[PDB]
Design an enzyme around this catalytic site. Structure first.
Site, short mmCIF file in Angstrom:
data_model
loop_
_atom_site.label_atom_id
_atom_site.label_comp_id
_atom_site.label_asym_id
_atom_site.label_seq_id
_atom_site.Cartn_x
_atom_site.Cartn_y
_atom_site.Cartn_z
CG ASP A 149 38.64 71.04 35.76
OD1 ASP A 149 39.87 71.09 35.50
OD2 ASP A 149 38.08 70.39 34.72
CB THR A 185 42.50 71.33 33.12
OG1 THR A 185 42.85 70.05 32.44
CG2 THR A 185 41.12 71.97 32.59
CB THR A 186 43.08 74.97 37.05
OG1 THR A 186 44.52 74.73 37.26
CG2 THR A 186 42.11 73.97 37.64
CG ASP A 235 44.21 66.28 34.09
OD1 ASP A 235 43.56 65.42 33.56
OD2 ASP A 235 43.69 67.43 34.45
#
Lengths: 48, 513, 522
Positions: free
Chosen positions: C49, C82-83, C388
């Site tokens: 991440d 997010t990645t 998420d």
């Protein structure tokens, strides 16, 4: 205590022959029961 | 500052060698013929010699994160198998080594290598399910197959030569539990001295405590009571109280009230009609003599772990708030007597009211075998308890890994493409697990494994490797079989943990505080 | 303290994070790789991440605070994928280095980004689709299509069908029938290490590490004679024999006064157990410990209890059972009793510590996903991946517009900004094109980890989107062959790409204005 040193010289000679450690331990385990029967046959009766 | 970072060049080579270097110690611990290791601790100058890497790899400091996850997943193996679980780290190390040679030859992207292990794990689950055998339909063969399941799982420690004497221990003990998976019910006591085969299975409880002064060593038809109440320390209060008195006359009355406190407390205990009393804490001298006056046994210094095992084995209940004598239950045993096991004499119980639990007496030659037999019996009946839940079993001992290789090789033909290289690499690395097992006994891992490989492809499932004679023998004749639930978690977790280690392109070392 | 002026602190300051952000570049997309980060305390955290690594990573240059400050607002705003998003956040500062060499003023570089940012969003509004125009059944079908591409990102993506029903059924329990609402606060995921990763189920409630004390009874009682939710209750005040907590003194003038102090607690032992037994509450949670003499009577009256429960978990229990925790023993009443469908303790391992699990089979306010896995490291990584997803559905609720994912958005707005740059002319023509040129690096980076030609795929995108205006043609991350994203069910939230790109553009405006760097000790 001397019984600990009696098996030191006998183990070094067997490891040089290329024998697996468990075979050496199993051979002493089978010979241990044979040594007990020898002491039982040589056991003499005694009064209480 | 002082942050040493390694890019994909250094981190790829350093992460693979980390698990191989430390993994060489657990390769020789595989199977009953596996060896042990020694660890020198800088603190207390102690050591632990065992073939289970859960207590080995945990105490070995290592700076390679690759084996850090291998130690955490050992607790899952400690919650399932517990004996000979080092194959999870050995197989993972082989997957890292084969993938290291796969990226140096095929040179495919590492994510493609992981996708091959994903399709290879699906073929391994099909071979174990189709080969699963459920003998629980016949209760006669089920109890007999528990011995065959025991002979496989009960060979770990150096004492495995005594398994023939120890097979009757776990055979009758699993029948006494009747569905008890908790080790808190199982009573395991250690005794120093005596022959290695002197361990027997007795029905009752064995207590290491004794009787204080006048308590007769032999009591028959006694009511066992367990109490958490405080005796030895008496008056200890912990109120907001303070003491103020005009003269020493009322000072002694407080001690006289202390006697009336215990005289009224033993009066409620006397209404129980018990010949045996047990406390969590120590017993003061005054109630100790009251126990002997009324003919009540006294047992003290029962810790938090031992206070439960008393009621769990005997089927009793821990009783507090003596104001309700008839609202609780009282434990009962046929014969309560003090025996002598080894140097320290123990208190023996016989004829327990509830046979839900049993006591296993363990006598051994050396202190090294005390913790060694504890690890072998850490999961013993619990492994047999998991076979009571999941009754599907499959022949183990190195052959099951060869059976899955036939399913992976068959699936590799339907896949083909460039992903079959990682699928075949999983089959090649899986066949190396019994190869290392043959290396531990000093036998031939070349000709024997080559014959076992062709034997599986010929359609013989029962073919396996004989550990004693070093030849090809059927597992049904030797009695080597493992449950489907245990082996499924070993193969799956080994592949899932290997997918994460191949994904490391960077190693960041922060400056120590 | 060092003296830095001119291009020294106007370039290497940006080049610093340029080399730092290129580290996580290999983690972009599901094809990315993990990383190892050792904490200063000696612990090791392994995750790919971008927000988790940069949060615990200690760097030198102060620009690291600018990257972390952005991630703090992204979690409360979008925080989805997010990645994927963390890579494009730093892509705006790489193109600005080329405009400095050409002689463009740094502020003119920053002001030129906001001009083309508003025009790129308007172009993305052309191809967006409205999911809210359908019914609730087709909306859940759109969630299943989105949960494939969106939810699955990191590892454990091997089998995505086990966690597919976890994220979908989580937002079904708490939601409005008109499909406008979100609550991510009452949804907390507490996992454990054990079993297999495929054993995850859906259990609404909390998982307490403390089990029932006094192992003299049954680990769990599934049914209840009183029914009506087992009558769950929680005592706010600590459970102890009543005594004044303030400083006080006791005066004993006679033996009778000392004997009354003996029956003092004895009368309170029966008074506390009868008030609970009168209400018939089976589950009674004591926040701080309990009395040793009362450890029995609870089992005597069949009153399972626990000790040392955190106050954070107590807030989720009262809202899930629709009850009120009892503030005072005298305030105890049957009106504050909760509703619990089923409660049991998981076997977990052999012994270890039995985990108390509270479960509500019906609709409840606290939604939880039962999670178990073999690997201990994947716990925190798999949880935050599904955490998420709560904001993923939130983006589909607050914003009904959804765009096709797969990097097709930046390619669509690339042709628009290129045409809009010719209207202004001047020196902003190369500045506006540079803003779209930085967005063109996202498709080329996606194909980098997959082993596909970056330009060969990008050249096909603009060639295909020229004939047809449909945006379904995008970069193929996982190697699915044909680049149509409609058959592959690849969709991304509109507000997700909107804010994350806009907030990154608004932040880079003040970053490029940095000339001198003055660092003082704390």
């Amino acid at each position: 205590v001397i019984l600990t040193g009696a098996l030191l010289g006998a183990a070094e000679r067997l490891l040089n022959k290329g024998i697996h450690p468990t075979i050496i331990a199993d051979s002493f385990q089978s010979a241990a029961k044979r040594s007990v029967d020898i002491l039982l046959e040589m056991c003499h009766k005694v009064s209480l | 500052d002082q942050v040493t970072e390694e890019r994909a060049e250094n981190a790829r080579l350093s992460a693979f060698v980390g698990a191989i270097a430390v993994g060489d110690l657990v390769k020789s611990t595989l199977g009953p013929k596996g060896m042990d290791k020694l660890l020198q601790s800088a603190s207390s100058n102690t050591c632990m010699v065992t073939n289970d890497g859960a207590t080995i790899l945990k105490s070995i400091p290592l700076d390679n994160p690759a084996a850090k996850v291998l130690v955490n997943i050992s607790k899952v193996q400690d919650d399932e198998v517990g004996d000979g679980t080092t194959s999870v780290t050995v197989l993972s190390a082989e997957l890292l080594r084969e993938a290291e040679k796969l990226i140096d030859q095929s040179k495919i992207h590492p994510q493609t290598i992981i996708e091959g292990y994903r399709l290879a794990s699906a073929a391994a689950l099909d071979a174990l399910t189709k080969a699963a055998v459920d003998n629980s339909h016949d209760k006669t063969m089920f109890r007999e197959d528990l011995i065959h399941i025991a002979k496989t799982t009960l060979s770990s420690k150096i004492l495995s030569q005594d398994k023939d004497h120890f097979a009757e221990l776990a055979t009758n003990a699993i029948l006494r539990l009747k569905g008890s998976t908790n080790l808190e019910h199982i009573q395991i006591i250690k005794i120093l001295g005596g022959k290695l085969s002197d361990s027997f299975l007795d029905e009752g409880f064995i207590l290491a405590k004794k009787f204080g002064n006048n308590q007769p060593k032999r009591i028959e038809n006694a009511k066992i009571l367990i109490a958490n109440t405080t005796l030895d320390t008496d008056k200890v209060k912990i109120f907001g109280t303070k003491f103020k008195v005009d003269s020493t006359a009322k000072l002694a009355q407080l001690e006289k009230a202390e006697r009336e406190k215990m005289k009224n407390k033993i009066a409620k205990i006397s209404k129980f009609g018990i010949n045996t009393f047990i406390n969590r804490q120590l017993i003061y001298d005054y109630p100790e003599q009251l126990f002997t006056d009324l003919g009540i046994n006294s047992i003290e210094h029962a810790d938090f772990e031992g206070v439960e095992r008393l009621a769990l084995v005997t089927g009793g209940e821990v009783v507090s708030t003596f104001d309700e004598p008839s609202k609780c239950k009282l434990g009962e045993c046929d014969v309560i007597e003090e025996i002598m096991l080894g140097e320290q004499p123990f208190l023996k119980f016989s004829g327990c009211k509830a046979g839900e639990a049993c006591t296993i007496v363990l006598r051994g030659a050396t202190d090294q075998t005390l913790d060694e037999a504890e690890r072998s019996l850490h999961d013993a009946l619990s492994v047999l308890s998991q076979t009571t839940k999941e009754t599907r079993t499959v022949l183990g001992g190195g052959c099951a890994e060869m059976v899955m290789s036939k399913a992976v090789d068959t699936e590799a033909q339907n896949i083909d493409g460039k992903k079959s290289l990682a699928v075949e690499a999983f089959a090649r690395a899986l066949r190396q697990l019994p190869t290392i097992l043959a290396d531990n006994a000093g036998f031939d891992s070349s000709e024997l494994v080559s014959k076992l490989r062709s034997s599986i492809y010929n359609g013989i499932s029962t073919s396996g490797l004989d550990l004693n004679n070093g030849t090809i023998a059927d597992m049904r004749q030797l009695g080597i079989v493992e449950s489907y639930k245990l082996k499924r978690a070993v193969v799956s977790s080994a592949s899932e943990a290997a997918e994460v280690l191949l994904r490391v392109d960077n190693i960041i070392r922060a400056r120590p505080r | 303290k060092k003296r830095q002026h001119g291009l020294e602190a106007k370039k290497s300051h940006i080049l610093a994070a340029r080399s730092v952000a290129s580290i996580i570049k290999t983690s972009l997309g599901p094809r990315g790789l993990d990383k190892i980060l050792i904490s200063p305390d000696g612990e090791i955290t392994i995750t790919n991440d971008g927000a988790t690594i940069l949060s615990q990573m200690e760097l030198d240059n102060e620009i690291a605070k600018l990257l972390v400050q952005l991630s703090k607002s992204q979690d409360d705003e979008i925080g989805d994928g997010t990645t994927g998003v963390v890579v494009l956040a730093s892509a705006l500062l790489d193109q600005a280095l080329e405009l400095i060499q050409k002689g463009i003023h740094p502020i003119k570089i920053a002001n030129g980004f906001d001009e083309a940012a508003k025009l790129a969003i308007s172009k993305l509004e052309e191809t967006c689709d409205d999911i809210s125009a359908s019914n609730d059944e087709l909306f859940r079908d759109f969630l299943l299509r989105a949960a494939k591409t969106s939810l699955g990102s990191k590892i454990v993506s091997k089998d995505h069908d086990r966690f597919a029903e976890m994220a979908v059924e989580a937002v079904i329990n708490v939601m409005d029938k008109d499909r406008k609402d979100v609550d991510f606060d009452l949804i907390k995921m507490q996992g454990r290490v054990g079993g297999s990763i495929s054993d995850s189920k859906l259990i609404n409630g909390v998982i307490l590490d403390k089990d029932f004390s006094h192992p003299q009874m049954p680990k769990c009682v599934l049914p209840k004679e009183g029914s009506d939710g087992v009558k769950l209750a929680i005592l706010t005040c600590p459970f102890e024999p009543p005594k004044p907590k303030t400083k006080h003194k006791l005066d004993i003038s006679s033996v009778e006064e000392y004997q009354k102090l003996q029956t003092y607690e004895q009368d309170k032992f029966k008074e506390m157990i009868d008030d609970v037994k009168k209400a018939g509450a089976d589950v009674v949670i004591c926040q701080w410990g309990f009395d040793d003499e009362a450890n029995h009577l609870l089992l005597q009256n069949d009153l399972p209890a626990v000790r040392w429960v955190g106050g954070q978990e107590l807030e989720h229990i009262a809202i899930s059972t629709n009850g009120r925790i009892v503030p005072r023993f005298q305030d105890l009443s049957k009106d504050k009793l909760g509703t619990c469908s089923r409660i049991y303790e998981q076997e977990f391992g052999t012994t270890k510590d039995r985990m108390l699990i509270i479960e509500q089979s019906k609709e409840t306010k606290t939604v939880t996903c039962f999670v178990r896995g073999s690997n201990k490291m994947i716990v925190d990584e798999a949880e935050r991946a599904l955490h998420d997803s709560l904001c993923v559905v939130r983006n589909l609720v607050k914003d009904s517009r959804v765009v096709y994912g797969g990097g097709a958005a930046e390619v669509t707005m690339s042709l628009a900004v290129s045409e809009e740059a010719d209207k202004q002319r001047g020196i902003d023509q190369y500045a506006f094109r540079g803003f779209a040129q930085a967005l063109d690096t996202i498709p080329m980076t996606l194909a980098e980890n997959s082993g596909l030609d970056p330009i060969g795929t990008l050249s096909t995108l603009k060639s295909k989107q020229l004939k047809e205006k449909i945006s379904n043609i995008g970069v193929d991350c996982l190697g699915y062959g044909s680049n149509d994203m409609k058959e592959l069910f690849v969709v991304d939230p509109f507000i997700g790409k909107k804010q994350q790109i806009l907030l990154a553009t608004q932040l880079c405006r003040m970053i490029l204005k940095i000339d001198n760097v003055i660092i003082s000790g704390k």
